[PDB]
């Protein structure tokens, strides 16, 4: 079932580019449909399958695939994500870069970090009293390495 509350949720805390994990949940001529999260699916092309030309999806996912994909746009008016394989792949690199995978948040407009709150820069350590935000963020962080560790897997494979 799908809401557009849960979908301008997605899109307002998932930057285009963003590297998501993806679950491979149907084939079509078109491409394959991922689900990235509850409620939230979006399709890959067929286009945006792989580099290699492809004519029909199967030639590279299988429906209980799991897939690192890219957001590539949102259309909340016609409630449709578009994700790209391709351009996952194309971006990766061996270096984590965790703006990619989650951490957009902790990196300003002109690109530089953002020490989270709670953490002191010019002392580089949490602060007292700031315990429960310093766990909230480190959960996070480590879920967008496992992100980039699972894309890289897919690059290995």
């Known amino acids: 079932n799908l809401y557009f509350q849960h979908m301008r949720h997605f899109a307002r805390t998932h930057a285009i580019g963003q590297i998501v994990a993806g679950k491979v949940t149907k084939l079509v001529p078109f491409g ?3 689900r990235v999260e509850e409620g939230i699916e979006g399709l890959v092309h067929i286009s945006e399958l792989a580099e290699r030309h492809v004519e029909v999806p199967d030639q590279v996912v299988a429906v209980g695939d799991d897939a690192m994909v890219k957001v590539i746009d949102i259309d909340l008016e016609r409630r449709r994500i578009s994700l790209s394989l391709k351009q996952a792949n194309e971006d990766y690199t061996e270096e984590f870069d965790p703006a990619k995978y989650g951490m957009a948040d ?3 407009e002109q690109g530089n970090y ?3 709150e709670g953490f002191d820069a010019e002392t580089n350590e949490w602060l007292e009293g700031f315990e429960k935000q310093r766990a909230e963020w480190e959960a996070r962080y480590a879920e ?3 992100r980039h560790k699972m894309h890289t897997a897919q690059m290995e494979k």
């Open 32 to 34: 394959a449909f991922v």
């Open 114 to 116: 953002i020490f989270p």
């Open 144 to 146: 967008a390495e496992r």
């Open 106 to 108: 902790s990196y300003d």
